[PDB]
Amino acid sequence: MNYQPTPEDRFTFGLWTVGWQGRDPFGDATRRALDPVESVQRLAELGAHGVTFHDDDLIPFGSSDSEREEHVKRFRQALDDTGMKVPMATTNLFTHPVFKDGGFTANDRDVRRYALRKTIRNIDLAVELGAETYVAWGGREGAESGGAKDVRDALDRMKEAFDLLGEYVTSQGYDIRFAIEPKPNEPRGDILLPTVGHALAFIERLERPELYGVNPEVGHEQMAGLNFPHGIAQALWAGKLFHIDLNGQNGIKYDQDLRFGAGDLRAAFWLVDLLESAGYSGPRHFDFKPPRTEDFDGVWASAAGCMRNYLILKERAAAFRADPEVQEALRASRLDELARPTAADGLQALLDDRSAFEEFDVDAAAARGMAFERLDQLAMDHLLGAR
Amino acid sequence: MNYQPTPEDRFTFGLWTVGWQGRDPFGDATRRALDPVESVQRLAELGAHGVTFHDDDLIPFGSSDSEREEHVKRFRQALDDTGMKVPMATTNLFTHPVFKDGGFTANDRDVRRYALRKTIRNIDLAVELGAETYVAWGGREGAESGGAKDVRDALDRMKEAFDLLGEYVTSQGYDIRFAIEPKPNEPRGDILLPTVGHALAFIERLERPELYGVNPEVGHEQMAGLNFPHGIAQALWAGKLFHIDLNGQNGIKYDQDLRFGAGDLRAAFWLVDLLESAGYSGPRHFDFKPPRTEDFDGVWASAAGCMRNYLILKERAAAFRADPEVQEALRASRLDELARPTAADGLQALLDDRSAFEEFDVDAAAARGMAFERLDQLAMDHLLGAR
Amino acid sequence: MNYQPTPEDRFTFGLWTVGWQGRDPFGDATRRALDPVESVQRLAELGAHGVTFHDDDLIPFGSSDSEREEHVKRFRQALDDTGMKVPMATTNLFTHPVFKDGGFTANDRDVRRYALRKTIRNIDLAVELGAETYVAWGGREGAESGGAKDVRDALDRMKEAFDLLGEYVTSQGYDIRFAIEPKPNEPRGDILLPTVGHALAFIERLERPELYGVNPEVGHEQMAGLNFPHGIAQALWAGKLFHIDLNGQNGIKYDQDLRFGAGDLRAAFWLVDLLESAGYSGPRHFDFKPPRTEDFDGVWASAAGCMRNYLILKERAAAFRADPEVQEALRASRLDELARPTAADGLQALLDDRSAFEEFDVDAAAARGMAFERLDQLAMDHLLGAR
Amino acid sequence: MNYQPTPEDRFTFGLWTVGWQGRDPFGDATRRALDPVESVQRLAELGAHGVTFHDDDLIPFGSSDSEREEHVKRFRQALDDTGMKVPMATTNLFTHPVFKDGGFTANDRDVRRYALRKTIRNIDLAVELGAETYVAWGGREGAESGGAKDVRDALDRMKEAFDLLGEYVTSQGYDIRFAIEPKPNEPRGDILLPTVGHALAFIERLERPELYGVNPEVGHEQMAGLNFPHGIAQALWAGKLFHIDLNGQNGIKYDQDLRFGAGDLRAAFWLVDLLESAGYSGPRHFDFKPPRTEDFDGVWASAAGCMRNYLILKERAAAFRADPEVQEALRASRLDELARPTAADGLQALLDDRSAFEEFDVDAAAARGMAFERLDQLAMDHLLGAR
Ligand SMILES: *C[C@H]1[C@H](O)[C@@H](CO)O[C@]1(O)CO
Ligand SMILES: *C[C@H]1[C@H](O)[C@@H](CO)O[C@]1(O)CO
Ligand SMILES: *C[C@H]1[C@H](O)[C@@H](CO)O[C@]1(O)CO
Ligand SMILES: *C[C@H]1[C@H](O)[C@@H](CO)O[C@]1(O)CO
Ligand SMILES: [Mn+2]
Ligand SMILES: [Mn+2]
Ligand SMILES: [Mn+2]
Ligand SMILES: [Mn+2]
Ligand SMILES: [Mn+2]
Ligand SMILES: [Mn+2]
Ligand SMILES: [Mn+2]
Ligand SMILES: [Mn+2]
C-alpha cells in the first residue's frame, strides 16, 4: 500500500521551495544555495512533473544579457534531460530594496514603470519555456499605516498595471493567462487584495476579465482564519481557478509554508475531495519551505511528503464518495435537495404557492434533524482508514 | 467643545441594538424587552435620524394579519410623532429553529421557498415605510462540517434567491436596492460570502448586479483580522458601498458588537477619514449591543457614545487633512504620485522608454525613504489632540 | 476493526453536553430539554463510565429543599441502575443575571459572598455523590472595558475565594481537589486566567497550592492560537493535570465545542499520544455540544463519535511509538539526547570544558540536519493508517 | 503643549531596534548598518536614558579577544561622552545556524552546553557595564512538528539552564536578576513558555525563584489575542514585572514590532495607566523596528514617536484618574467594593450569614446596572482630549 507519484499526477514545485536557504527574520541561512539544474534533476527523480520560477531565481538580479542567455541554456538543457515542464512562471517584485513600498502600487511612479518592465521581460521568457500561467503575488503592495496609501488610488494603479499586461499579451498573440495570488499580510502590515474574494471581485473591473483568474494558497486564506475549501469552491463556481498553491499552516500566525498535509489535515482532505470531484486539471503546485532545521536529505524528504500526502488524501476522498453507506448518508442530510432549484416554477408560482408560506408547517420542518454528525464521522472513519 | 448629533448627521440604529435583552450563549436576559415605540422616542431624543428593523423585531413571529396591522400602526404613529425615518429594513432568517441549516441555502428545498416568501412579505413592508435599502445577512448559510454543504450548489441556490428577489422588485417597480452583509463565522462554523471581497465577487454573477451592493460591518471584517478601512475603499472603488454597519470589536474572537469607537480606535479614525473624504452619503448605522452588565441608563449612554465617537473622529480627521504640515508630509511620502497614471503614455511608449528599465537607477530609487513614520505620528498627534 | 468503548476507558460527559438545547446568540432552542435520568441511561448504553454536572443542571435554580431532595433521589437511582459514576462536579456561576459581572470577582461584594455560598452547597453535594474533582470555570470573571475591573484587586478577590474554599474542604475533612479551567474570552470580552499558564501561575500564590490543579479544555487554548499538547505537557511537568476537557475547535473564533477529533485532528493525535505516554489516569471528559442542526439521533451519534475518535487515535499513537523505524528516527533526531542532562558534571566542569566553547566547532554542529520532516511523515503515515 | 523626553523618563532602546537594517523573510536590507557609537550619540540627543544590547550586536560573532576589547572600549567611551546607561543586556541564541533547533533546549547536548557558555560570557560583560537585568528570549526553543520535541524533557533542560545561570550569578556575587520574555510563535512554529502566564508558572519551579521575573512585550501577548494590560497586572500581582518591552502590533499576525502607540492604541492607554498607577520604576524599553520603507531620518522620527506617545498617554491617564467626575463614576461602578475583602469576617461567619444566601435577594442585585459604558466613554473622552 504505496503511493508513488508519476509525472501524470501533475505535481510541480517552485525553484524557491526546495531552494530555500533557511534565512528567516531572526536567523542566517542554514543551507547552501542549490543550482536550479540540480533541483530539476532531484525533483524529476522523485516523480515531479515540472518546476516553476520567479525571474530572479533563474537569472541573478543584474545579470548582463550574456550571463542571462547562459543561465537559460543550462536550465533548458536540464529540462530536456529530464522531461520536466515549466507550467507557470512569476516575477520577484518583493526582494530588492527598490520594491520596499510595492511594485505596481509603489507611491513613486518611476518604480511602478520599472516593475512593469521587469514583469514584461519575464512573460517573454515564460512563453519561450512553455508556461501557460503567469502568477502575480503583490507581496509589497499594501502598508503598515493608514496615511501611507490611499487604497482607491492604489487599486486604480493596480488595475492600470494588469490592463497593460493584458494589452501586451494580446498584442503579442501569446497564449498565457494571469493568476493573482492573494495574501492578507506579511511582509506588509496589510496587503491589497487580501483574500480569494478580494482578488475575484477585482478581476471583474479589468478591461479583459477572461485573461485573469486566481492562484489561491492554502496557508494564505488560513492566515485570515477562513475555510480554504469554501474559497476554492467559490473560485471554481466563478470559473476562475487557474492554478493553486498547496502547503500547510497551523492557524493565524506568520506564513509557515509547511509541506502539504501538515497544518490543518481535515481541510487538506476536503480540499483534495473538491479538486478531484470538480475535475481540476491544472498543476498541483507545492509552494512550501523545508524547515531550516533540515539538511539536504530533509529537503528531499519534505518535498516527497508533499506528493505522498496528496496521494493518500486522494485515495481516502475517493473511497469516501464511493461508499454506498456515505451515498445514503448524503441523501439523509439532503445534499440531493441542495442541488435542486428552489423555484424552477418561477416567481409567480412561488408567490401563489400556499405550501411555501400560508400552509407551511414550520414546526414539522424545524424538527427534522440534518444528520450531519453521522455524515462527518463517516468522513472521519474514511480519512483515518477505520473504514 | 461639545459634539451633539442632530438628525442631519444621519445616525441610525437597529431596534435590535438598544433592544438587546442580554441573552448570550452562557446566560439569561439581564434586561426586560423594550417596546419599539419607546426605542423610537428615546433615540429621537438623543439626536438619531432614524431606525431600522428586522421583520421579527417589529411583528412577533406568528402574528395574525390583525395583530400585524396593529404593530405597524403603532410604530407608524411613533415615527410621525418624532420625525424619525426608516432607511433600511432586513429579514430575520436566523432565530427560528426552521432556519437551523440556513434560509436561502438550507439543504431542504421547502425551507428555501419559505425563506423567500418571508423575505418578500418584508420588502413590501419596508417600501411602505420608506426604506431605500434592504439588507441581507445570511447568518445561518454555511456549515460546521465539510460534507454537510456542497458550496458550488449552495452558491447556485444563493444566486437563485437573490435573482428572484431582483425579479420581484423590478416587477413591482420598487425603488429599493439590496445590500449583502458578510460575516466570516458565528453562528455557523464557517459562513458563506465571509468577507466584503467574497460578497463583491458574488454580486458580479447575479442577473442584475446594479441592484446589489454591500453592507460591511466593522467587527465582521476584524473577526478575520482584515483592515476594515481597506475593505471599505475597495467597496467604494467598485461603486458598491450601499450602507454600513458601525461598531467595535477587539480582535479575532466572538462577535462583540461594542459601541462605535471601542475596539480598534485607530481603525475607527481611518474609517471616518475615508467615509468623509469619499463623500459617503448613506446612513451612519450602529449595529451594536449595550453590554449585558448594563441597565437602561447604560443602554442610552452606550447609544449616545456611538454618535459622540463618530463626531469626535470626524473633527480630528478633518483637522488632519486640513493641516498644511500634513499636506506637505503627504507630498513628501508621494501620495500625489500614487494618484497619477503609471503609463498614460501607453504601452509602446513604456516599452521604448529606457528610463523605465535600461537606464533606471535602482539604487538611487531604493535609497529614497518613504517618510511614512513622520506622517503616521502627525496622524497620531491629530487623533489625540496633541495638535 | 472496531473501536468500542467500555466503562474501563473512563469516558465521561457533562449533563449539559448531550443536554444542550441548541440556543445560540442568534437562535432559539432546536431540541427539547432532556431529563438527566434519560441522559444517564443513554450514555451508559453507549459505553460511557460516568457523568458530571453543574449544580443547576441537576437542581433547577430556585428549587425548595423538598424539590432538591427529589431531584437528587431520582438521579441517584439512575446511577444505581446503570453503574455510572460521577467523578467531577462544578458550579454554574454564569447563567443567572446576578452573575453578569462575575461570581468570585463581581464588583458588588454581596454577589461575591452569594457566589461562595452557592459553590459550598454544591461541594457537599459533589462529595455525597462521590466526585473526586471539583471544577471551577470563571466564565463571567473579566471585562469588556479597561476601567471596569482593576485586575490586581480582582486577583486578590479570586485568591480570597479559592483560599476560603480550601479552608472549607480541609475543615470538613473532604477528599476533593479543585481544578481551574481557563478560557481566554467569551462571554466576557477578556476572561481572567486566560490560559493554562495563567492558571498554573495563579495556583502558586494560594495558601494550599496542593489542593489545586488545572482542567484545560482543547478548544480554549486553541481560541488563543496556542498548542494544546504543549500546554498539557507543561501542566503534566508541574504535576497539575487534575482533569481534562476534550472537544474540537476550528481556530480562533467563538467557542465551538465540536465533538472530540473534529477541529485540529493532528493536535488530537499528539494530545492522545501524550496522555497515554505520560500515564494520565483521570477521566477522559467530553465538554462538547452536538450542533443545533441535529435531532436526538444526531446527539447520540455525536457523543458516540467522541469516544470512537479517542480510541482510533489511541491505537495510531501506540502503533507510532511501537514502530522500530520510528524509534530509529527518534534517535536520528536526537530525542534521546534531549532527555539527558545538559550538565550533570556541574557548573565548574562546564566552565572548564574547552569542548563547550573555546574548541567547539560551531560550523560542524550547525551543518547537522535534525531529520524532523522524515520523522513527521512517519507520524502522518501512522495517523492515516498508510502504515 | 509639547512632550519632551528627558533621561529622567527612563526611556531605553535596543541597539538592534534603530539598528534594524530592514531584512525581512521576503527582502534584502534597505539600510546600511549603523555603528553602535552613532546610535548611542543619536539616542542621547533625542532624550533617551540608555541602551541595551544582545552580545552579537556589540561584538561581531567570532571576534578574537583583541577585537572584543576594542569594540567594548569604543562603546564605553560613547556612554561616557553622553551619560547614557546600559540597564539591561541579553544573549543572541537565535541567529547563528547552530541555534536552528534552540539554545537551552536544542536536542543536541553539545549545542546546549555552548549556549550556556555563550550566555555566561555575556553576563560578565553586562555586569561590567552596569546592567541590573539580564533578559532571556528563547526564540528558537520550540518546534514546527509534534514528534521533534518532547516538551517535558524540554522544560527539564530549560529549568536546568536557568538553575545553572542562577548558580553562576550567586557564586560570583553579582547583583543581576533574570527576566524571561515570552513569545507564542515566530520563528518556531510554536515557542515554549508562550505567554506571560506560562513564564510565571515556570519560574515557580526554579531552584531560586526570587532571581527571576518576566520581560513581557506588548506585541507578543497580542500575537495570541490576549489583553496586554491584564497580563501585566498579573505579573505585577506576582511581584515579577522586572522589565518591559514596549511596541505596537495590529492583531494576530507576524511580529510587527511597530513604534509604541501604533497598533492597539486603547491597550497602550490602559497599559500606561497601569504602569504609572502601580508605580513601575524600571526602564521604559522600546523593542521596535522602524519600517523598512524608511531612511535614517524616518528611523529617528520613529524612535522619537515612541517616547512622545508614551508621554501623551501618561498625561491623558493622569487627567483621567484625577477627574472628580471619573472618581464618582468609579464609585458608581463599584470599583471601591472590588478592593474590599469579600469575607474578612471568616468562613464560619460567611456560612452563618443568612444575607449571603438564605435571604439574599438575587433579583434586586441582578437588576443593578454596572454603569461601565458611561465610565468607558469618560475614558474615551480623556484619551481623545475631548475632556
Ligand atoms: C514566489 C511566489 C510566487 O509569486 C507564487 C507562485 O505561485 O508563490 C510565491 O511563493 C508567493 O506566495
Ligand atoms: C440583524 C442584522 C441585519 O441583517 C443587519 C442589518 O444591517 O445587521 C445585523 O444585526 C446582522 O449583523
Ligand atoms: C459547564 C462548564 C464547567 O465549569 C466545566 C466542567 O469541566 O466545563 C464547562 O462546560 C465550562 O467550559
Ligand atoms: C533581541 C531580543 C531580546 O532577547 C529582548 C530584549 O528585551 O527583545 C528582543 O528583541 C526579542 O524580543
Ligand atoms: Mn505562503
Ligand atoms: Mn504561493
Ligand atoms: Mn456583528
Ligand atoms: Mn450588522
Ligand atoms: Mn468550550
Ligand atoms: Mn469545559
Ligand atoms: Mn516582537
Ligand atoms: Mn522584545
Side-chain angles (χ1 to χ4, degrees), chain D residues 26-98:
Chain D
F26 301 89
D28 290 348
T30 64
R31 289 190 297 261
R32 66 144 181 101
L34 268 184
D35 179 345
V37 169
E38 207 196 312
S39 301
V40 173
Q41 299 193 197
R42 294 269 32 236
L43 285 175
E45 289 165 353
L46 299 175
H49 158 84
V51 279
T52 74
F53 66 97
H54 272 280
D55 47 352
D56 296 2
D57 286 331
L58 189 63
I59 300 125
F61 185 91
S63 283
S64 72
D65 296 17
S66 143
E67 307 168 289
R68 259 207 140 210
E69 162 159 2
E70 222 149 77
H71 284 287
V72 182
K73 160 187 79 94
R74 280 182 85 234
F75 185 62
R76 189 110 227 216
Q77 190 51 54
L79 303 168
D80 288 348
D81 296 338
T82 61
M84 291 274 284
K85 298 307 175 231
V86 176
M88 181 274 274
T90 178
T91 326
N92 186 314
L93 310 174
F94 51 84
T95 304
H96 200 281
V98 80

Side-chain angles (χ1 to χ4, degrees), chain A residues 293, chain C residues 330-343 360-372, chain D residues 97-116 141 148-149 157 160 188:
Chain A
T293 59
Chain C
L330 289 169
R331 274 187 198 106
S333 295
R334 285 91 78 199
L335 271 311
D336 57 312
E337 278 187 46
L338 181 68
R340 296 210 261 285
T342 295
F360 178 62
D361 186 352
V362 304
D363 301 312
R368 290 178 207 133
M370 298 315 302
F372 288 157
Chain D
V98 80
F99 301 123
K100 71 200 199 282
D101 187 38
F104 298 164
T105 70
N107 285 357
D108 288 308
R109 177 167 177 283
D110 64 350
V111 167
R112 309 195 290 275
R113 281 176 81 89
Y114 175 71
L116 279 167
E141 318 306 326
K149 208 46 69 169
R157 300 293 76 74
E160 188 188 0
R188 304 315 302 271

Side-chain angles (χ1 to χ4, degrees), chain B residues 232-297:
Chain B
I232 294 313
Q234 185 169 173
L236 289 165
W237 186 73
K240 299 282 180 190
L241 184 74
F242 292 6
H243 197 264
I244 197 166
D245 280 11
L246 309 174
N247 59 21
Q249 169 69 18
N250 276 301
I252 304 174
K253 60 179 73 155
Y254 68 103
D255 180 38
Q256 305 197 279
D257 289 350
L258 301 174
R259 85 181 183 290
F260 180 69
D264 185 346
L265 182 62
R266 287 253 274 168
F269 166 86
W270 290 124
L271 166 71
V272 177
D273 170 67
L274 175 65
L275 300 172
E276 296 303 324
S277 88
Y280 168 68
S281 62
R284 274 72 183 162
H285 182 244
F286 299 106
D287 180 12
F288 87 108
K289 286 174 174 39
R292 76 193 275 284
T293 59
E294 306 306 285
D295 62 17
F296 293 116
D297 291 328

Side-chain angles (χ1 to χ4, degrees), chain D residues 195-387:
Chain D
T195 80
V196 169
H198 306 69
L200 293 173
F202 166 83
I203 288 162
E204 293 308 320
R205 295 277 173 294
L206 297 180
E207 304 298 307
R208 290 176 155 92
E210 72 289 341
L211 288 185
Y212 313 83
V214 287
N215 182 45
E217 185 176 306
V218 176
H220 299 181
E221 296 308 297
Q222 290 175 357
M223 287 171 70
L226 296 179
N227 182 311
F228 190 77
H230 284 198
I232 294 313
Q234 185 169 173
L236 289 165
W237 186 73
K240 299 282 180 190
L241 184 74
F242 292 6
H243 197 264
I244 197 166
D245 280 11
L246 309 174
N247 59 21
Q249 169 69 18
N250 276 301
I252 304 174
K253 60 179 73 155
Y254 68 103
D255 180 38
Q256 305 197 279
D257 289 350
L258 301 174
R259 85 181 183 290
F260 180 69
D264 185 346
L265 182 62
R266 287 253 274 168
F269 166 86
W270 290 124
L271 166 71
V272 177
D273 170 67
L274 175 65
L275 300 172
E276 296 303 324
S277 88
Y280 168 68
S281 62
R284 274 72 183 162
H285 182 244
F286 299 106
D287 180 12
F288 87 108
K289 286 174 174 39
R292 76 193 275 284
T293 59
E294 306 306 285
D295 62 17
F296 293 116
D297 291 328
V299 164
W300 308 118
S302 200
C306 287
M307 300 187 276
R308 177 181 181 78
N309 290 335
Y310 191 98
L311 299 168
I312 298 156
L313 275 348
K314 181 177 162 175
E315 169 199 78
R316 308 301 161 85
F320 172 71
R321 302 283 183 189
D323 181 355
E325 208 174 313
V326 163
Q327 299 168 6
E328 179 195 294
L330 289 169
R331 274 187 198 106
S333 295
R334 285 91 78 199
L335 271 311
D336 57 312
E337 278 187 46
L338 181 68
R340 296 210 261 285
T342 295
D345 51 350
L347 214 204
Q348 195 63 240
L350 171 66
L351 288 177
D352 290 329
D353 188 3
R354 297 158 66 74
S355 75
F357 194 79
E358 303 87 330
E359 319 222 341
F360 178 62
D361 186 352
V362 304
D363 301 312
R368 290 178 207 133
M370 298 315 302
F372 288 157
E373 296 283 284
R374 176 161 186 271
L375 172 68
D376 192 61
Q377 189 65 37
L378 286 169
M380 179 87 71
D381 288 351
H382 269 286
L383 176 50
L384 305 173
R387 273 177 155 86

